[PDB]
Every structure is written in C-alpha cells, then in structure tokens.
Amino acid sequence: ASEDEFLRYLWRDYLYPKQYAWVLIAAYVAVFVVALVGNTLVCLAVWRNHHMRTVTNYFLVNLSLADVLATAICLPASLLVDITESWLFGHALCKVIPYLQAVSVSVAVLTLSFIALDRWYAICHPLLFKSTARRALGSILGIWAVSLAIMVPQAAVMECSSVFSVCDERWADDLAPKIYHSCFFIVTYLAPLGLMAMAYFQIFRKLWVKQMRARRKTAKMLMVVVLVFALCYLPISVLNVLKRVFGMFRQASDREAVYAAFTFSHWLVYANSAANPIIYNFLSGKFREQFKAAFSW
Ligand SMILES: CCCCCCCC/C=C\CCCCCCCC(=O)O[C@H](COC(=O)CCCCCCCCCCCCCCC)COP(=O)(O)OC[C@@H](O)CO
Ligand SMILES: O=S(=O)(c1ccccc1)N1CCCC12CCN(c1nc3ccccc3o1)CC2
Ligand SMILES: CCCCCCCCS[C@@H]1O[C@H](CO)[C@@H](O)[C@H](O)[C@H]1O
Ligand SMILES: CCCCCCCCS[C@@H]1O[C@H](CO)[C@@H](O)[C@H](O)[C@H]1O
Ligand SMILES: CCCCCCCCS[C@@H]1O[C@H](CO)[C@@H](O)[C@H](O)[C@H]1O
Ligand SMILES: CCCCCCCCS[C@@H]1O[C@H](CO)[C@@H](O)[C@H](O)[C@H]1O
Ligand code: NA
C-alpha cells in the first residue's frame, strides 16, 4: 500500500549511501592513479628531454614531487577518514600524515610563487637577477627546507585520542587555533595567490620575437595552473577558516552535510595533483610529445 514511503526509506537507508560511497571511492581512486601517473610522467619528460630543462620546468617538477607526496601518502588516509570519520593509522601517523599534507601544500604554493617571481623578473624587470637552472635547484632545496620547518607546529598539535580513535589538532586554549589558522590561510593561500595574480597581470600587460611567442605559450600555461590551484584550494581553505577561526559547524543538525562539504574539499585538493599534468599535456607541446611517447610505449 504505502509503497512510496518504503521507496523513500530504501533510498535513504541503502540506495543513497551506496551511491555516495561508490562516487566517493571512484573519484578518489581515479584522482590517485591519474596523479601518480601524470606526475611521474612530468618528471620523466624533463629527465629524458634535455631541451625541456628550463627553470620553469624544474619548478614544475618540484610541484609534481609535492603532489606525489600528497597523493601517495595523504590521499589514502584522507579517503579512509572521509569514509569512517575516525583514525585507523595510529598515534604516529596521526602526526606524520597531516604534517606531510601541510608540507605538500607549502611546497606547492611556494613553488608557484617562485615560478611567478622568475617570470616577473624575466619579463617585467629583466637584467636585475640572473635566473639559472642551477640556482633553481638551490631555490627548490630552500623551498623544501622552509616548508619542512614551518609545518612543525602543525605536527606538534596533532593528537590521536580514544573516544575508536580520532586524530585532530589539540589546543590548550581557544585563541591559539584562531591566530594559527588565520596565519595559515594568509600564508599558504591568500597572500601568495594575490601576489601571483598581480604578477601575472603585469606579465599579461607586458606580453600581449620568437622568444615572445614562446613566453606567451608558457605564461598562458602557468596562469591556468595558478587559477586551477586557487580554485581547487579555495573550498578547504575557507572551510578551515570558518571552522577554526569562526567556530562554525560545531552543531550537528546535519552532520552529514558538513561531512560532505569537507569531503568534497579534501578531494578537490587531491584532484589538483591530477589536474596539473593534464594542463601541461594540453598547453605545452613538449610535455604533450613526451606524454605521447610514454603512452605509445
Ligand atoms: C606569503 C609570503 C610569501 C609569498 C611568496 C612570494 C610571492 C611572489 C609572487 C609574486 C611577486 C611579484 C608581485 C608583482 C608585483 C605586484 C603587481 C602590482 O604592482 O599591481 C599593482 C596594482 O596594485 C594595487 O592596485 C594595490 C594593491 C591592492 C591589493 C589588495 C588585495 C590585498 C591582498 C592580496 C595579497 C597582498 C599581500 C601583501 C603582502 C605584503 C600595479 O598595477 P599597475 O600599475 O600594473 O596597474 C594599475 C591598475 O591595476 C589600476 O587598477
Ligand atoms: O584543512 S586542512 O587539512 C588544509 C589542507 C590543505 C589546504 C588548506 C587546508 N589544514 C588546515 C591547516 C592545517 C591542516 C590540518 C589537517 N591536515 C591534514 N589532516 C589530514 C588527515 C589525513 C590526511 C591528510 C591530512 O592533512 C592538513 C593541514
Ligand atoms: C562511505 C560513506 C558512506 C556514508 C554516506 C552517508 C549517507 C547517510 S544516509 C543515512 O542513512 C541512515 C540509515 O542507513 C539513516 O539512519 C540516516 O538518517 C541517513 O542520513
Ligand atoms: C618566504 C620565502 C622567501 C624566500 C626568499 C629566498 C629565496 C631563495 S633564493 C635561493 O636560495 C638558495 C638557498 O639554498 C640558494 O642556494 C640559491 O642560490 C638561491 O637562488
Ligand atoms: C587536503 C586533505 C586534508 C584531509 C583532512 C582530514 C580531516 C581530518 S579532521 C578530523 O578527522 C577526524 C578523524 O580522525 C574526524 O573524526 C573529525 O570529525 C575531523 O574533524
Ligand atoms: C590574527 C587573529 C585573528 C582572530 C580572528 C577572530 C575573529 C572573531 S571570531 C568571532 O567569534 C564570535 C563569538 O561569538 C562568533 O560568534 C563569530 O562567528 C566570530 O566572528
Ligand atoms: Na596541489
């Protein structure tokens, strides 16, 4: 008789959760394999092709290294947490994995910043600072040094406490998380991305002669990369400011809605690592050639 009520309960209790888990696991697995393969191909492309060993491509290889760190270590953990909302990797990985995720984000945004800086001095203010690949290696090492150092507090606050275990930041007072997460948002997101936007805007005014055509191609590619980065990282950055600085989502009226929003934001962060190699494949003929050689083999 009441078949419609039975169908509604079947959708809520079985059909919807099953489809939700399927889409979640499929999106994560697809991003995982695509990111691993494409970033490994970025590194292989610049290692086999000596003519692609430019300062920009060296920084892009570093960006692929940071994306591979995130994708290989943190992505499976983020997937399992978005599934169970609990921590199953133990007290030590509770510090290590979030630490490596934050270090990956810092290396990513600092690498994009240094690419924007190299392009801005090369195009807008030439002949002030020499930019060489060998100095790019030192800039990359310093990027990793700074990133590993400044994310130590992130590791220090992580704790894995019994409830099943939960891994989360532990704060002795209400003010410290607000100050720290304000600084985290401004340093890893807003400030570098706003400065990169102003730099690339000046580069666009300057560029728009074989060198100018090659520079237009590479600058269009780098602008796309920065834009997709800002888009992929906006949701999680805003949600963490709202949670940690404004105290939102403490209520559990629709706890599943908060879980879905945070889950999609985590997945967007991991999707950026899969996106970047595809961007090089469509906006760089040289990367596209090396990727074609990889797929043919
Ligand atoms: C995290 C720390 C580590 C970062 C790592 C380093 C990152 C390195 C990246 C890039 C460096 C290159 C920067 C490029 C130089 C900056 C580019 C620039 O000068 O833009 C100016 C315009 O600004 C303006 O209106 C005034 C600026 C208004 C800014 C409002 C938004 C602020 C937030 C945004 C971030 C602020 C951060 C500040 C940190 C000190 C000049 O305009 P222009 O004459 O051409 O035409 C005028 C026309 O726009 C009038 O409408
Ligand atoms: O919202 S974040 O996720 C974030 C991430 C990226 C950009 C912006 C914000 N976030 C806010 C600041 C400190 C941090 C805490 C949690 N960390 C983490 N826990 C993790 C648990 C499992 C796997 C990876 C993990 O990474 C990563 C860094
Ligand atoms: C991999 C993660 C999959 C979980 C997706 C969450 C979907 C929750 S629907 C959930 O179904 C329950 C009965 O099963 C009801 O009691 C709840 O009221 C209703 O909200
Ligand atoms: C917030 C981050 C601001 C960073 C400003 C400094 C940029 C690093 S320059 C780079 O430093 C390396 C250190 O190892 C040297 O080896 C290289 O020769 C040199 O090119
Ligand atoms: C870019 C990828 C970032 C991944 C972020 C993982 C979020 C973990 S936060 C913390 O995780 C606990 C499980 O340990 C949950 O029970 C809590 O509800 C939640 O607050
Ligand atoms: C660099 C340091 C920056 C600290 C920023 C603190 C911002 C104020 S939080 C404030 O707390 C209220 C308590 O009632 C909440 O109701 C509001 O949602 C929220 O606006
Ligand atoms: Na990324």
Structure commentary:
- This protein has 297 residues and is mostly helical.
- The protein has one domain: Rhopdopsin 7-helix transmembrane proteins.
- It is built from nine helices and two strands.
- The chain has helices at 3-48, 55-84, 90-123, 133-150, 152-157, 175-207, 210-244, 255-283, 285-296; strands spanning 158-162, 165-169.
- A two-stranded antiparallel sheet has the order 1-2.
- A hairpin with a 2-residue loop joins strand 1 and strand 2 (165-169).
- Helix 1 (3-48) packs across helix 9 (285-296) and helix 2 (55-84) packs antiparallel against helix 8.
- The radius of gyration is 21 Å and the shape is globular.
- The protein starts with a helix and ends with a helix.
- The chain binds ligand PGW, ligand NV8, octyl 1-thio-beta-D-glucopyranoside (4 copies) and sodium ion.
Shape annotation: globular
Superfamily at the CATH H level?
Rhodopsin 7-helix transmembrane proteins
Biggest β-sheet: strands ordered side by side in the sheet: 1-2
Please report the distance between the alpha carbons of the first and last residues.
61 Å
Number of helices: 9
CATH architecture: Up-down Bundle
Helix percentage = over 70%
Strand content: under 5%
Order of helices and strands: HHHHHEEHHHH
Structural class: mainly alpha
Briefly note the CATH topology name: Rhopdopsin 7-helix transmembrane proteins
Please tell me the total number of domains.
1
- Per CATH, the class reads Mainly Alpha
Gyration radius (Cα, Å) is 21 Å
- Mind summarizing the main beta sheet? 2 strands, antiparallel
SS elements, strand count: 2
Which kinds of small molecule does this entry bind, naming each only once? Answer: the ligand CCCCCCCC/C=C\CCCCCCCC(=O)O[C@H](COC(=O)CCCCCCCCCCCCCCC)COP(=O)(O)OC[C@@H](O)CO, the ligand O=S(=O)(c1ccccc1)N1CCCC12CCN(c1nc3ccccc3o1)CC2, octyl 1-thio-beta-D-glucopyranoside, sodium ion
